[PDB]
Design a protein around this ligand. Sequence first.
Ligand SMILES: Nc1ncnc2c1ncn2[C@@H]1O[C@H](COP(=O)(O)OP(=O)(O)OP(=O)(O)O)[C@@H](O)[C@H]1O
Ligand SMILES: Nc1ncnc2c1ncn2[C@@H]1O[C@H](COP(=O)(O)OP(=O)(O)OP(=O)(O)O)[C@@H](O)[C@H]1O
Ligand SMILES: Nc1ncnc2c1ncn2[C@@H]1O[C@H](COP(=O)(O)OP(=O)(O)OP(=O)(O)O)[C@@H](O)[C@H]1O
Ligand SMILES: Nc1ncnc2c1ncn2[C@@H]1O[C@H](COP(=O)(O)OP(=O)(O)OP(=O)(O)O)[C@@H](O)[C@H]1O
Ligand SMILES: Nc1ncnc2c1ncn2[C@@H]1O[C@H](COP(=O)(O)OP(=O)(O)OP(=O)(O)O)[C@@H](O)[C@H]1O
Ligand SMILES: Nc1ncnc2c1ncn2[C@@H]1O[C@H](COP(=O)(O)OP(=O)(O)OP(=O)(O)O)[C@@H](O)[C@H]1O
Ligand SMILES: Nc1ncnc2c1ncn2[C@@H]1O[C@H](COP(=O)(O)OP(=O)(O)OP(=O)(O)O)[C@@H](O)[C@H]1O
Ligand SMILES: Nc1ncnc2c1ncn2[C@@H]1O[C@H](COP(=O)(O)OP(=O)(O)OP(=O)(O)O)[C@@H](O)[C@H]1O
Ligand SMILES: [Mg+2]
Ligand SMILES: [Mg+2]
Ligand SMILES: [Mg+2]
Ligand SMILES: [Mg+2]
Ligand SMILES: [Mg+2]
Ligand SMILES: [Mg+2]
Lengths: 403, 403, 402, 402
Amino acid sequence: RIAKEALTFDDVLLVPAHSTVLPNTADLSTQLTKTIRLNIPMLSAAMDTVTEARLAIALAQEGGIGFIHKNMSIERQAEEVRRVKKHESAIVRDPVTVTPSTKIIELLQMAREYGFSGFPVVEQGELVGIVTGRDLRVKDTVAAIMTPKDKLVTAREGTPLEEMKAKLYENRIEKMLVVDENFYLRGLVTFRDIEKAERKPNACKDEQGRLRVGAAVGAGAGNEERVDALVAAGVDVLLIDSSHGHSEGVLQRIRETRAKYPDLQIIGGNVATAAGARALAEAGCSAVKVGIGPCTTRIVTGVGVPQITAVADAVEALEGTGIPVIADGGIRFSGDIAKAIAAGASAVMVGSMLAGTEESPYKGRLKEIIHQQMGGLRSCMGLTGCGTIDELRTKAEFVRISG
Amino acid sequence: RIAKEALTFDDVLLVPAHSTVLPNTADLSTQLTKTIRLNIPMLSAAMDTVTEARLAIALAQEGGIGFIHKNMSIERQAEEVRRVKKHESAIVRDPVTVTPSTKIIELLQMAREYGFSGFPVVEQGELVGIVTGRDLRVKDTVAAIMTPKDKLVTAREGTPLEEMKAKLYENRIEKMLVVDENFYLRGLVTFRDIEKAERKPNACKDEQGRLRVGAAVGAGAGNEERVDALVAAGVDVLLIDSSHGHSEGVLQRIRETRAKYPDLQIIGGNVATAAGARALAEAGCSAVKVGIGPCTTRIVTGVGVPQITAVADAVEALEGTGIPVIADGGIRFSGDIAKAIAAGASAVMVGSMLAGTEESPYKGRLKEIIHQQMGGLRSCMGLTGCGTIDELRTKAEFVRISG
Amino acid sequence: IAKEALTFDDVLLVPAHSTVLPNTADLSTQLTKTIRLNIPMLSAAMDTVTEARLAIALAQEGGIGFIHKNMSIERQAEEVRRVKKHESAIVRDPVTVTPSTKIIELLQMAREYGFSGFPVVEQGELVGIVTGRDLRVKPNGDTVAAIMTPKDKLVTAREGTPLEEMKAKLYENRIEKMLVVDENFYLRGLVTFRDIEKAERKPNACKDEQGRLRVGAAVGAGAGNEERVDALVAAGVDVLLIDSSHGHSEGVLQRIRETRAKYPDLQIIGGNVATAAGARALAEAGCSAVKVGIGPICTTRIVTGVGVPQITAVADAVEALEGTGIPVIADGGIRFSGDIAKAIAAGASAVMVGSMLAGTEESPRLKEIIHQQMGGLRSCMGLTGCGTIDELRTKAEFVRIS
Amino acid sequence: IAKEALTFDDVLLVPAHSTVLPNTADLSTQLTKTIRLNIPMLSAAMDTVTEARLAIALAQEGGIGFIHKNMSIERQAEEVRRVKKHESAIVRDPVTVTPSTKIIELLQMAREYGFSGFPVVEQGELVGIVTGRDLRVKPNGDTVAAIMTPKDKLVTAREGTPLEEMKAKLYENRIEKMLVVDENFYLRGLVTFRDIEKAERKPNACKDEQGRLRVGAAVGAGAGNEERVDALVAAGVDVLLIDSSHGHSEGVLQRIRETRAKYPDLQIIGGNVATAAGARALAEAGCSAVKVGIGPICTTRIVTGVGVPQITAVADAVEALEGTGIPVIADGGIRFSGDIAKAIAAGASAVMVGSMLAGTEESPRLKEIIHQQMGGLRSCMGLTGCGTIDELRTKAEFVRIS
Ligand SMILES: Nc1ncnc2c1ncn2[C@@H]1O[C@H](COP(=O)(O)OP(=O)(O)OP(=O)(O)O)[C@@H](O)[C@H]1O
Ligand SMILES: Nc1ncnc2c1ncn2[C@@H]1O[C@H](COP(=O)(O)OP(=O)(O)OP(=O)(O)O)[C@@H](O)[C@H]1O
Ligand SMILES: Nc1ncnc2c1ncn2[C@@H]1O[C@H](COP(=O)(O)OP(=O)(O)OP(=O)(O)O)[C@@H](O)[C@H]1O
Ligand SMILES: Nc1ncnc2c1ncn2[C@@H]1O[C@H](COP(=O)(O)OP(=O)(O)OP(=O)(O)O)[C@@H](O)[C@H]1O
Ligand SMILES: Nc1ncnc2c1ncn2[C@@H]1O[C@H](COP(=O)(O)OP(=O)(O)OP(=O)(O)O)[C@@H](O)[C@H]1O
Ligand SMILES: Nc1ncnc2c1ncn2[C@@H]1O[C@H](COP(=O)(O)OP(=O)(O)OP(=O)(O)O)[C@@H](O)[C@H]1O
Ligand SMILES: Nc1ncnc2c1ncn2[C@@H]1O[C@H](COP(=O)(O)OP(=O)(O)OP(=O)(O)O)[C@@H](O)[C@H]1O
Ligand SMILES: Nc1ncnc2c1ncn2[C@@H]1O[C@H](COP(=O)(O)OP(=O)(O)OP(=O)(O)O)[C@@H](O)[C@H]1O
Ligand SMILES: [Mg+2]
Ligand SMILES: [Mg+2]
Ligand SMILES: [Mg+2]
Ligand SMILES: [Mg+2]
Ligand SMILES: [Mg+2]
Ligand SMILES: [Mg+2]
């Protein structure tokens, strides 16, 4: 009964091809699900050491999409989603505000805590002043030291980012207040954010232009109050994440959630076989995750399928569904990403890679890791003659290496 | 002549399957021989650093069955068996007693040595008092300080463990004396033992409810006085253990022992081929052990078959005999156990694993090792869609990995 | 300028004629004129060294520990009060439980005090007792009244009963705990079997005139020292340590004088000094005992450059106070058993230690550190021919080594 | 207080005018007034240093070893008696075998004494000899009578025969062993070829008036010292060492006085002291030699704080005994050959060592440790101009180094 043969990343190499593709001109975009299109093929995994609201924003601005983890309160997990959801490429709807009668003592705690010293001043939604770093080098309430209503530089909602950069610079100020017909605060946008959005203009957003975001839950029932709470928080894609997704209890959860939310984008995981991939698709998954022990699952449980064979078997299973496959774990170096995609994955998940970054809960700023990795994928596509992630997943051939 | 190909644990992985099996509800029981059923698929090996009476009791209470080693006197080996055999789940028949005229000086040596300070007091079988830790904080003979006959809390043989827990608690005491119609001591059972037997209620016992136990001998004749002495001591399964069990001298011993004890459960080992497995079965083995160099046997002698192929070849050989196969040695991690079973073993032997424990002759208590390992097997069965050890040995498919 | 000054390591004790064995030597010494110790050892007033638990253990070995001042004034009083409520083996005001108490709260009440034996009291009267045995099985959720040994089955002894007696009652009933009661069956205290055995094996407890374990506490320069003083005096502290990085200050001397005024009665330890004139200041300000040690953590000297090597320091204080009957404690610099003996030989009437006990069970086991430290002292007493601490303070001779 | 005190490392020996070569220097020195050594070295009374085997080897190099007191009184007497039964090269009371003895027991009798040559004695008379040669082949199981060289083929010498003579008999017959016999052909002892060669190459054995190797033993404070004393006196010990961690005790002084009473005759070493008045006590109590060394295992000072640096110690004893003719031994602190020379120069008449020999073949090889240690002494004797130990004790000069 002891026979088949299966292949991992280190077992294969990608062959070079005639190419007209250049690294800086390859297109890194890919359909995560039939309705969500990433600009880079990367997801951050929902681990308490990788992804909360901070990194999810950082990654969606890069082109990707982060997944808030369930090792936190139901209510704290929903507010994380809302925090990403209230983000644009570079405008912050629902900023952290103050009121005129905020004491200035209580105001320096907000800045010591929040890391930015600049807040719009409000009065039940009506914008009323603004108080920033410069207005604190003295001692009373905000109202004494705030820049009053009549001198506020603002922009109506809809005005393009350039018109606000013009305005911000002409007025020699760092914070633009987005404002209503009735002067109700609708958004805050710094000079920092507009520069960081003219470069890297490939944020992954929905049809309302707001940052896309995922969230994970486990299966096993009882998660209904949670699954409902992240939907209510307007998550883009719900992750129903399992150590073994071909079990009946997981298929069940997925069947149930698809009933209560016919258009919500769901990833089920993790499978490792064509059967699991079909059953996860058949229960209602928008995309399936693949990663059974690629890892103590192997040493402890004795169970696993190496990623190269697992991905390509899930993908063969699902031809003609439009249900994409995510490769999850086993990721050592950058070229492993390229192999995973070449084996037919439409995106990859990573978590250990990003677990020490700045924007995560030994460090780095996210934009540099994503750059080194995405430059590696760019190299590969130029070498394989593959302009789009579409081309790579279907064109590039493999070669088997030994030692 | 230099051709075949053979597979070890690290050469294979177990594939995931559709599953309705949960770890905490999988059934770990398996037929060791046609008449002995373990509750977990584990044997401890008969090594002077692993298994004597202490660990054999510890393991049989867990579900398994330990094998007393032959690196000790014939007479000391039989008394080890009797010691396990006089154990129930949690009642000690033939406790360590005293008599009223035992000096109390000689009594503290018994406690310094034996590790428990509580002994029933007897007078040629008649129970007569009891002396425990509390009765020593003074200085004469036992008779001065013992709790007299008329105040002894006892229970007739047959009373359930709960009725004795009731009685022990109602009387605010830690030791229950099991007693005859004629007040002859028949057993001792502490409060400790009843708690440790309400949890972990899967002790592996015979039809008299007494702890099961194995014992090893070598072949090569002259062992007859020993083989007879362990039978006389009421061992459950005799191990006739050899570096090479397909030799004629071992087949012979086994043929002879089966003649003198037609219903004694015998394991012969070790073989590594279908031929050896058939010949060991044909000589009269209840179960065959498989492990030729999986180990200096390999480096020194140059000889061996990797376990995965050896097990599955022995098991194919023996289809339709009801003679089970034990995988022996080569065991690194927990998932190796699962692979061995999946290759068709009905139990596994381990020894190095348990060589530092508490209950063995760098440590641990046995119940924790057996827990971590059996939880690993439980993981695997949930992943492979396999509820019983029966299902695992016959359903779960394999996948071949390289590097 | 420049006068030579020796540390412990610069000296060695001379063997003299000896009629003293280790087992013979008398380790007792007068802390102050009212307070005599049974081993010449003090615990430092440090958050990682001495609190109520350790101050009771030191006392049971023969010494005194000092409760640190890193607490609210009220919390420290209870520490000191907690020590004071231990006699020989009796334990006054033991923790009780009411026959209402739920067992889920009773076992809640177990994991934090450590023990499981609580007397059951119902608004003054003593009605039962629960021990870990009664807890073993859930009654059926009911309360403590449904597991307890009841009043008509309580084994008690009248207060004043000899300790050897209520031990024999304890053996005869085979029970671990003894209830001590007044003539109205009111709970005077709890005495366990374990305590009585640690009172034959530790007959050298440094106790009070009412039989209570002894204890000290430290106050500092903080802007509420006055009230800290009074809290401890009223909480019944045996000795007060006005403790200073630099006791030859006018701030300390102030406090020392102001306190001896308000409390003509209270045994006072002032420190630290390292000079004769420093010792005179603390004495004349009204101290019972001077603590010496400025310099002997070796960052005092490094960051500041200030210090006096311990042996010269101790011996200048002793000499500056020659005739006054004011004792001198040696604080810090003490690594080995042999440093203790040198401190006492230079005239210290007792020794303070902190980091030598900082990782003990009683620290925030200790029976053993004291046994080997005091065992070396005994060795040294035998080798030098001094069987009384007062002998080793005045008799032993020194030799300069390189 | 405080008088300076030097160790070995604090001093250096001054070169003086010298007419002495290393080969010239006379290493002999008077242990006591009856006992003179040929090298100024003693073995310590330690379970891992000196027993009968080593006490014979030290004696053959010129010194005396001391049998430890970690034994039954009777077992120690046999140790001491065992040493005493070696003359120059003769070996009295050698192990014999009876013509009954089975060879399976004879070879059993080989692996534990080490050797294979046993004289064969049948109830007094000498009847043969078996050596490893006769054992080589099984006779056919028979006994020793069937392999032995028989009486009519025995090569013997009459007791009193010169050692050079019975060597030449040995060569002439080409046999390894020589039997020494009285005028009745009774076995007086055994002399091997190996011994005679180690008696020309080691002509400096510290022997007794009957020609017997010399030896000492230690008694302690234990509750049966009296009988330990007598066992050794009767077993024929040369010197008795009443040995103490602290000999300025009234317990030792007691024992010293009580023994010199019972034995006006017996050469006694008392120790250890480290003071003049300590040396006087031991002398006046009736000692032949005082052992010095309290402090020089360096845990004496660490656990206890007590000790005197070895050089000051040795020199205070020597001076305190100036005129009495009582010698002084220096015990411990001795690492190098150069420490020995400093001890003797400070006035020690001899030196004790333990850990310097603790891992030798003769310990529970040694010819070599003594050769290099004594070779350095010779070097130092040449460089300082002292050819007699008495010279190096009184002539050499010291210089203080840092
Ligand atoms: N009140 C707020 N609520 C939410 N996010 C805010 C708020 N104020 C600032 N931010 C965000 O946090 C970032 C911190 O920027 P910060 O206010 O320190 O910079 P700045 O003062 O505009 O710029 P500079 O550092 O050039 O002086 C902003 O760029 C914006 O992304
Ligand atoms: N949109 C705005 N309309 C009117 N005044 C504004 C606006 N944004 C900022 N200001 C005011 O301009 C001044 C500086 O604002 P800005 O955010 O550029 O400074 P800052 O963050 O305090 O500067 P720094 O870079 O020194 O930390 C403050 O008095 C602030 O209240
Ligand atoms: N006389 C005996 N002979 C054989 N086995 C015994 C004997 N007495 C006790 N045992 C076993 O050894 C164990 C040691 O238990 P022990 O007597 O120290 O506990 P106990 O006093 O009943 O309990 P506790 O620790 O709660 O006070 C018992 O739990 C039982 O398994
Ligand atoms: N079955 C019994 N019948 C009568 N008396 C008993 C019985 N078992 C124990 N005792 C008595 O009860 C008392 C305590 O018994 P138990 O075994 O509970 O205590 P222990 O092991 O000495 O306690 P500890 O937990 O303090 O070590 C003793 O006097 C003992 O003789
Ligand atoms: N209610 C209490 N209040 C204060 N101190 C207590 C109390 N109970 C116990 N102690 C202290 O704790 C110790 C006894 O605790 P413990 O509960 O472990 O005794 P025990 O179980 O009855 O004796 P053993 O464990 O030997 O069978 C005593 O030394 C005693 O000082
Ligand atoms: N003074 C007393 N009077 C009456 N009953 C008592 C008394 N002290 C304890 N008991 C009862 O005796 C039993 C427990 O005895 P004890 O307190 O001496 O041991 P324990 O510390 O609970 O047990 P263990 O040693 O097993 O931990 C309980 O039923 C308890 O209520
Ligand atoms: N019977 C004996 N009794 C006591 N000592 C003995 C006895 N026999 C030998 N010795 C000691 O052992 C040494 C000789 O032992 P050994 O048996 O090795 O001599 P050997 O074989 O005759 O000489 P070689 O080995 O050089 O040929 C001597 O130095 C001697 O002191
Ligand atoms: N004094 C003696 N008189 C007669 N025969 C002797 C005498 N000494 C030894 N022999 C005999 O000489 C033979 C052995 O000679 P010797 O004892 O000198 O050497 P050995 O130590 O046995 O041998 P080896 O050097 O080979 O170990 C034996 O036959 C022995 O009995
Ligand atoms: Mg700014
Ligand atoms: Mg700025
Ligand atoms: Mg007990
Ligand atoms: Mg108990
Ligand atoms: Mg107890
Ligand atoms: Mg030879």
